[PDB]
């Protein structure tokens, strides 16, 4: 089916290091392929325009490790879409945490972002940078950072952003006059609340609307390197997002969050943890890391706030 | 010598039509000359703080057909004055007919508005759009008009409003935004009480003191011209305000009245050539001096009847012929509210002479509509299919004015049935029927958004709601519409010939098919009118190949549920509804779709 | 038709200011659009790759009085192409004028230039520096120009100039430490010869290929723009490179050429499509390329020629007139300026007062007398008095720009350094002074290339400037002394008024140590220029002055930090109130060798 023997195997280890390969939403020519996690679920569907946002068209199957799966024919990119959970008595409509792109149908300010199927094939010219790139040799090379926060570099009109390709050029002229080797972005993944910086994260696998398409951002980095400068990445393993529909509470039951009602109370954030003993907690987080370095070709991934870890 | 001797046989004539060249106050800079008709007055005199408001310092002579008039001295601009009228036995001090402009002396417009010696002085920078304005061309043009009362619109602070100037570039920046064609302005000439709208006139003449000077208006409208923006002026008439000092009984006696239920004693005596100049010569004082493009007239049918009243129709009669001669690009529109034949026709024709109605009927029938369930519309299907019988009887505009979203009538959004899904449907499919439907459009201010509220004069629009997703959705709406309107021919001639229909008997289904069309270009309406997505939906077409989906409703821009064609719809060579090829579609839920073959 | 009606009734009237709109050639998805003005012609076809340089294949229709216009489906921008026309026997191969963009097929420009379908398309970001720019207003700003060849400035590589893109970067950081306001462009239009410097220009409407794409040249004019700097382009009405390919005898027989028996590459300004052309290209590069600045160079050769017997060329004068009148009225923030080398009055007045509406007017007296006053030794200097002082007398009649160009420093006139008297340290110092003078005269203020630092070498072309002069410490402290002269400028007002406001004398009859002391005033500030054109130092040198109180030494030319002896007042000078050149109070000062002194009293 969907899920190999080897895939369920590694997710119930804690190994699943590439799990955006099966999590997701995952297009195909004819139909998409969706993949979520919610052990403690009675009942998982998807929901869309493609069956008029039908609960019972399409329930994904029960696999292993409290995986689900199913596959939806006409439901293609760009379509927007919701998981409908049932936790016995009580169901809730729920994002996809591996979602590659969402996006505000709305297109208004404060709105919900809806995760969208999208297709992340991209072709790269960043040949050069990436081979003679250097990491922990860095720290016998010269290492200056310019820290930004995309929408509030520039703007190409009063209270509108550059996209991520209207800001490339830009930015990397900008970069390149006052010499800097590398820039460090604020928390690109999505996020509701604009006024959080990006440190309240809804999509981890998903880049933020508000400056593109996910190709517009792969444009991007791959711009920069062109032009020999380096994308640092501010990645935010340590709290997510309070949003009602986002990873909080999502089987109807603890998952990301930690299961023990004491160790949930933590000064910084609490409740919003994330329980680093789950194996599929640390499925998702690592692959993360992993997803941002080969999808999106970046040099570098900043935590912060790692004393409250 | 005032007054040209042509001047008072012009004005013995009724046809002094520029007669605002030479009545009312006009400065010089030693002092300002005062022109008033008062046939039925013994003596007029000026008083001002030019002579102690003394009467007897200032009389005019009367010279021919009850025209008075003096020259002051040291009457200045920006100064209020008063006209003492001696009737016999009484005296009385009246407002200026003819005044420019006036102000509130205590300071509230419901105590005391005086008239104030103004210079009309504007250098116009619109050079450019009046020498393309089109009007009796605009038959075969888009014309959108955005409905507007300006108080209302936007305010500074609550209970402040925006002056003429610092309206400008928000209704400008706004009106390209949603791509109207035309503003009309709710009557700007001056009225005491703000809660009227201004349809209790006192000063034709003079623009409200509320939002600035006369200038300040010009410059307002000449901005907008630049911008492309026309400007229609709603004109009232058909009654003036029950002011005491204003027109009622203004020499002693009966002169702007006759010597109707709704105005009794208010109504002009279009009989008297004096009255004939006075409303005709300010028709074309705003044509002129402020270089409107349009003026609408209101309520109609209580000129025309009291049956039939003849001195009034030959008055509009009149009055739509003297626009047309000296500004042959002009438009007027007309709202009569009785089925009263040819308003849109030329007076050579037996017609009012007017070139656009309301279409009121129109109006009436799809509110009534659409204030139904969709359960219950199969029952009134011919309420909705009914509309096209009438809809070529005039040149019209279709209309959702204030009127409707007042006095408890409902905003649109209030009106429109279940819960708020179906509500921003609903209003978004009744808009995409209205742009479809034959003639011009109208829209109330707010309506882009579909706000919560009955137009509350007395307080702003509620833009806060264009945050929150349905609302928003409906402002995309109303503008891509409006995009489709300009870019497509098929909308801009209201013809029988620009109308064809595909379907009208799906009552159970209750959905329309219809075709709109100039030589080459078709586009195709396919509504669903109720909250059930339709598959396999075939509709009938003249041509085959490849179609595309032009716009459709239910897209999740505008809040819908995104069911869609998308584009890419080909036509099969089997026959449906009596036509050639057909079109195998699906129907979205409450929605407008709109194809056209591709090119 | 791809011509309306109204578009051959503006072509006829001379007033279609737009024909790059409808001239050329545009491209569209599946084809391009070609229109050609060729009034003697009998037939008219594109010939390119997209017919097999076909001449039958698309022959142009005629659509009003002497334009062709044709459709080609399959051109597409980068194609080359081409116009064939023909005069009766004979047919010749031609160069669109309207050209947007021009190659060389060879890979050379002097064997062959050929026109490319190009689209225009482009982004800006320079909305922010639009709404400041002043324009006329300018006039009461300080207007300060570095004068450039692109291709000259620097190499990447030796012999090998910078692209469009590769500039920018490097001229705007180079511009704005050293203060200039704007920039102004020698002709980038499309030239055949490189070492015409632009000056002979074939495709008006096409920056030149030898720095990039057009979008190139916009993106500089945009980087430049979001830095703060102007940009002002040479434009050359006057003539037209002789080309058998382009321009002369467009249909065979005259047309851009007058009819009537650099003479023959004149334009003809009679023709109402000629002018049509020229003030389209006027208001073309300030349109597409939000170009601030036009400056047209040999105006006089305009004016005149050489029972009516007039040697004033009034086709021209129109020309210019209706040519200025333009501008503003579709650019009301532009700039023009002219070099006329004649006493032509009025040059930049407006045209409703009999002017030739230009903006500006380049001081060109000036830079004559000046110069002439500075190659004479100081020795010297005392017979040649009149020739300093009489300069105010002329400053006042235009709008003036103090200008110091390429023209002065070619051809056997050599360099600005080269030009003055004496020893290294003296050259310093007279260069030192001159710029100072310069800045202190009334008049906006303009230096071409090298001068700057002080280069020995006469300008050239093929070469790239001397910049390893900058490791000498002359050639620094010249730069570093224009730097601060452009900085106070900039910040004192009382330089940025020009008029017989703005200057006051304070004495002019020191013959034998040939000083001048002047002054610059706007409301209540002032500034005191107090000048030594002799390398012998003056002590207890007294100069009237109006206010009494402290003084404040604004700037010396003889500091060290500009490469001077460091003679100076230490700062502060003490008012004596004690009368002096017909004025209350007197500073006594020391005047350092070949020095200028900015003085200021104390706020």
Not at chain 2, 263 to 287: C, E, H, M, Q
Request: charge should be negative; aromatic fraction near 16%.
């Amino acid at each position: 089916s969907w899920l190999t023997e080897e895939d369920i195997r590694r997710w119930e280890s804690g190994t699943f290091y590439d799990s955006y390969r099966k999590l997701g939403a995952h297009p195909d020519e004819e139909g998409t392929w969706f993949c979520v996690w919610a052990p403690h679920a009675d009942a998982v569907s998807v929901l869309g325009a493609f069956n008029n946002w039908d609960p019972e068209a399409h329930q994904l199957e029960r696999y292993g490790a409290g995986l689900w799966a199913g596959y939806v024919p006409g439901a293609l990119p760009g379509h927007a879409y919701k998981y409908r959970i049932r936790h016995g008595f009580y169901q809730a409509d729920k994002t996809d945490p591996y979602a590659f792109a969402m996006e505000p149908p709305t297109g208004s300010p404060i709105e919900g972002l809806a995760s969208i199927i999208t297709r992340l094939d991209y072709t790269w010219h960043d040949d050069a940078w990436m081979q003679r790139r250097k990491g922990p040799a860095s720290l016998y090379e010269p290492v200056s950072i310019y820290e930004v926060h995309l929408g509030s570099w520039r703007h190409k009109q009063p209270g509108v952003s550059f996209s991520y390709r209207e800001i490339a050029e830009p930015l990397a002229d900008y970069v390149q006059d006052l010499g800097f080797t590398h820039v460090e972005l604020l928390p690109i993944m999505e996020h509701p609340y604009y006024g959080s910086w990006g440190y309240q994260v809804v999509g981890y696998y998903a880049p933020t609307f508000r400056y593109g398409t996910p190709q517009d951002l792969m444009y991007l980095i791959d711009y920069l390197h062109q032009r020999g400068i380096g994308v640092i990445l501010d990645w935010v393993p340590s709290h997510f997002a309070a949003d009602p529909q986002g990873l909080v509470y999502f089987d109807g039951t603890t998952l990301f969050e930690y299961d023990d009602p004491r160790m949930r109370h933590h000064p910084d954030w609490g409740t919003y943890v994330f329980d680093y003993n789950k194996p599929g907690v640390r499925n998702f987080l690592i692959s993360n890391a992993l997803f941002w370095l080969d999808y999106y070709h970046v040099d570098g991934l900043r935590v912060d706030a790692v004393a409250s870890m | 010598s005032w007054l040209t001797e042509e001047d008072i046989r012009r004005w013995e004539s009724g046809t002094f039509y520029d007669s605002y060249r030479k009545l009312g106050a006009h400065p010089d800079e030693e002092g300002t000359w005062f022109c008033v008709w008062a046939p039925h007055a013994d003596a007029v005199s000026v008083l001002g703080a030019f002579n102690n408001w003394d009467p007897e310092a200032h009389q005019l002579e009367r010279y021919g057909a009850g025209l008075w008039a003096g020259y002051v001295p040291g009457a200045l601009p920006g100064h209020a004055y008063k006209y003492r009228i001696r009737h016999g036995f009484y005296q009385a001090d009246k407002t200026d007919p003819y005044a420019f402009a006036m102000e509130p002396p205590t300071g509230s417009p419901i105590e005391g508005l005086a008239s104030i010696i103004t210079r009309l002085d504007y250098t116009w920078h619109d050079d450019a759009w009046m020498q393309r304005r089109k009007g009796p061309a605009s038959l075969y043009e888009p014309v959108s008009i955005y409905e507007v009362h300006l108080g209302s619109w936007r305010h500074k602070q609550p209970g402040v409003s925006f002056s003429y100037r610092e309206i400008a570039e928000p209704l400008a920046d706004y009106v390209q935004d949603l791509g109207f064609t035309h503003v009309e302005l709710l009557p700007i000439m001056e009225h005491p009480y703000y809660g009227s709208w201004g349809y209790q006139v006192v000063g034709y003449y003079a623009p409200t003191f509320r939002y600035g000077t006369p200038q300040d208006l010009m410059y307002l409208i000449d901005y907008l011209h630049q911008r492309g923006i026309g400007v229609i002026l709603d004109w009232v008439p058909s009654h003036f305000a029950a002011d005491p000092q204003g027109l009622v009984y203004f020499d002693g006696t009966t002169l702007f009245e006759y010597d109707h239920p709704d105005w009794g004693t208010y109504v002009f005596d279009y009989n008297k050539p004096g009255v004939r100049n006075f409303l005709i010569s300010n028709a074309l004082f705003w044509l002129d001096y402020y270089h409107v493009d349009g003026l609408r007239v209101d309520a109609v049918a209580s000129m025309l009847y009291r049956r039939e009243n003849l001195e009034a129709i030959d008055f509009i009669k009149k009055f739509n012929e003297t626009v047309y001669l000296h500004f042959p690009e002009a438009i007027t529109i007309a709202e009569e509210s009785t089925a009263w034949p040819g308003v849109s026709a030329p007076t050579y024709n037996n017609g009012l002479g007017f070139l656009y109605k309301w279409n009121m009927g129109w109006m009436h029938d799809t509110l009534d509509y659409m204030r139904r369930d969709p359960v219950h519309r199969k029952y009134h299907h011919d309420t909705l299919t009914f509309s096209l019988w009438y809809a070529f009887s005039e040149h019209y505009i279709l209309p959702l004015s204030h009127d409707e979203v007042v006095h408890g009538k409902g905003s649109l959004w209030t009106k429109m049935p279940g819960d708020d899904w179906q509500k921003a449907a609903n209003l978004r499919l009744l808009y995409g029927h209205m742009w479809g439907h034959p003639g011009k459009k109208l829209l109330f201010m707010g309506g882009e958004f579909g706000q919560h509220h009955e137009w509350n004069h007395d307080t702003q629009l509620e833009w806060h709601l264009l945050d929150q997703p349905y609302h928003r959705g409906i402002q995309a709406w109303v503008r891509d519409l409006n995009h489709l309107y300009r870019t497509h021919p098929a909308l801009w001639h209201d013809g029988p010939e620009g109308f064809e229909w595909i379907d009208f008997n799906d009552r159970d289904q209750s959905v329309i098919c219809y075709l709109r069309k100039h030589t080459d270009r078709l586009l195709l309406f396919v509504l669903n009118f109720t909250p059930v997505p339709r598959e396999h939906y075939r509709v009938g077409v003249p041509i085959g190949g490849p179609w595309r989906e032009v716009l459709n409703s239910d897209a999740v821009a505008y809040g819908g549920s995104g069911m869609g064609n998308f584009g890419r719809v080909e036509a099969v060579p089997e026959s449906w509804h009596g036509r050639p090829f057909h079109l195998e579609l699906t129907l979205p839920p409450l929605a407008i779709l709109i194809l056209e073959p591709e090119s």
